[PDB]
Structure formats: structure tokens, C-alpha cells
């Protein structure tokens, strides 16, 4: 499996999105809301905790093997292109880093 | 000493932390233990509570 990951990362440019010169990158988004926190009417804001998932296609990361799926923690998240998704109306947003990312 | 240094240096040669132990062979079993040093204050205004823990995983 290490060979597969090394081959995928070999000759990979994470600065460029997939289909950079072909078509828009289609991303399918999912949300699971754990809790909509208290609504601060004084500040006009509300806290919300979510599991945010994004699915897209990157033909650069194609691999032919019997594994059929590589399940990985955050370690390679910085090694590939990730969407630039941000929340437009978020006064403050934080990711979680305990125990690990 | 020399034996200690060579053991430490050569331990991770050819090691991939991206993969869990026993990937494709078995299920990784983790034994968990918690020692609550101090059950922190419970915040009614937040539905929140703090707890200081020594968290052990084997
Ligand atoms: C002005 O100046 C300030 C101060 O300098 C500056 O603020 C700083 O901004 C930078 C971003 O620009 C920020 O750096 C990143 O932090 C990432 C981790 O989280 C850190 O923050 C969390 C939470 O802090 C935030 O909390 C609030 C929001 O939630 C809010 O206050 C802020 O946003 C705040 O930042 C914190 O919990 C973390 O604590 C630790 O745990 C991290 C675990 O990943 C670890 O990286 C940290 O070093 C740190 O670990 C030590 O401390 C803990 C205890 O706190 C101990 O338990 C540990 O043992 C350590 O002693 C962090 O503080 C951090 O992950 C970023 O580094 C990752 O990403 C960058 C960018 O991609 C990479 O270059 C890094 O290599 C690294 O990427 C690896 O890991 C990710 C997964 O996390 C993988 O996806 C990557 O592929 C990669 O892993 C692969 O490669 C590496 C080698 O590259 C390899 O080792 C791996 O095995 C693997 O192969 C980055 O450091 C910084 O924290 C922040 N400083 C502050 C706030 O003090 C401003 O930006 C400046 N402003 C301007 C405009 O200039």
C-alpha cells in the first residue's frame, strides 16, 4: 500500500485543482449537525457543530490495485489538493485537534 | 550509549505512519484507560463540563 501512496504522490502538484483546463471541479457536500449551540441575540450569532464532508474526483489519484479504497487519517490531507471551502457568514470557526486532527 | 542510539535510529527505517498496524491483516485493538485527576467545574450556562484526565491508549 505504501507503493500505491508513493506512486500517487509522485509527480503530483497540489497547487493545481483537478481538471484545471477542462471543466469546473464538481464537489458534493454533506453535513451532519451534532448540535446547534446557543443563539446569542446580543451578538446576533449562533454556534453550530458539524461533520462537513466533501466528495470530488481527481484523476491524478487513480490507482489500479486489489485494495479498491485507501482509508487514511489527516496525514495526507496536506499532500493533495483540497477545496478552498469557507463559511461566508462565520464570525469565528475552529477545527478540532484533540487528540489528533 | 551506542546500542541505545543505534536502536533508536534504526527503529523507523522503512516505517509508514500513514498506515495503521496490521493493515489488511487484522483489526487494530486499542486498550483505553482514563484517570480523572480532577472532575472540573460543570457550567450550567453552557451545558458544558471540564475534566482533567490522564488518557492512556495501548
Ligand atoms: C502571525 O503569527 C501567528 C503565530 O505564528 C500565526 O498563527 C499560526 O498560523 C499557522 C497557520 O498559518 C498555524 O499553523 C498550523 O497549525 C496546524 C495545527 O494546528 C495548530 O493549531 C491548533 C489549534 O490552534 C488554533 O486554534 C484556534 C482555531 O481552532 C485559533 O486560536 C487559531 O486558528 C489557532 O491556530 C493547535 O491545537 C495545534 O497544536 C499542535 O498540534 C498540531 C497537530 O497537527 C501540530 O501541527 C502543532 O505543531 C502543535 O503541536 C505541538 O503542540 C501540541 C499542543 O498544542 C503538542 O501536543 C504537540 O506535541 C506539539 O508540541 C497547532 O498549534 C498545523 O498542523 C500546521 O502544520 C500543518 O500544516 C502546515 C500547512 O499545511 C504544514 O506545513 C505542516 O507540516 C503541518 O502539516 C502536516 O499535518 C497535516 C495534518 O495536521 C497534514 O495534512 C500535512 O500533510 C502534514 O503532515 C505531513 O507532513 C508533515 C511534514 O510536513 C509530516 O510530519 C507528517 O507526518 C505528514 O507526512 C500549522 O502549524 C499556527 O498554529 C498558528 N500559530 C498560533 C496560533 O500560535 C499567524 O498565521 C500569523 N499571521 C500572519 C497573517 O502572518
List key phrases describing it:
part of a larger assembly, 2 chains, A: 101 residues, mainly beta, two-stranded antiparallel ribbon, 1 helix, 8% helix, elongated, B: 58 residues, alpha+beta, 16% helix, binds a molecule of 10 linked components (NAG-NAG-BMA-MAN-MAN-MAN-MAN-MAN-...), membrane protein, GABA, Neurotransmission, Ternary complex
Q: Nutshell version of this structure?
A:
With 101 residues, chain A is mainly beta. Chain A is 8% helix and 24% strand.
Please describe the topology of this protein.
This is part of a larger assembly, with chains A (101 residues) and B (58 residues).
Chain A: H1 2-9, E1 28-40, E2 45-55
Chain B: H1 2-10, E1 32-43, E2 48-57
Antiparallel strand pairs in B: 1-2
Bound molecules: a molecule of 10 linked components (NAG-NAG-BMA-MAN-MAN-MAN-MAN-MAN-...).
PDB class: membrane protein
Keywords: GABA, Neurotransmission, Ternary complex, Inhibitory postsynapse, membrane protein
Entry title: CryoEM structure of human full-length alpha1beta3gamma2 GABA(A)R in complex with GARLH4, the TMD of Neuroligin2 and Megabody38 in a closed state (StateC1)
Question: Could you characterize what this model shows?
Answer:
This is part of a larger assembly, with chains A (101 residues) and B (58 residues). Chain A is mostly beta strands. Chain A has one helix at residues 2-9; strands at 28-40, 45-55. By secondary structure, chain B is of the alpha+beta class. In chain B, strands 1-2 form a two-stranded antiparallel sheet. The radius of gyration of chain B is 20 Å and the shape is elongated. Chain B starts with a helix and ends with a strand. The A-B interface holds A 1-2, 5, 38, 67, 72-73, 75-76, 99 and B 16-19, 23-24, 46, 55. The complex binds a molecule of 10 linked components (NAG-NAG-BMA-MAN-MAN-MAN-MAN-MAN-...). A molecule of 10 linked components (NAG-NAG-BMA-MAN-MAN-MAN-MAN-MAN-...) is lined by residues 74-79, 94-95, 97, 101 of chain A. The PDB classes it as membrane protein.
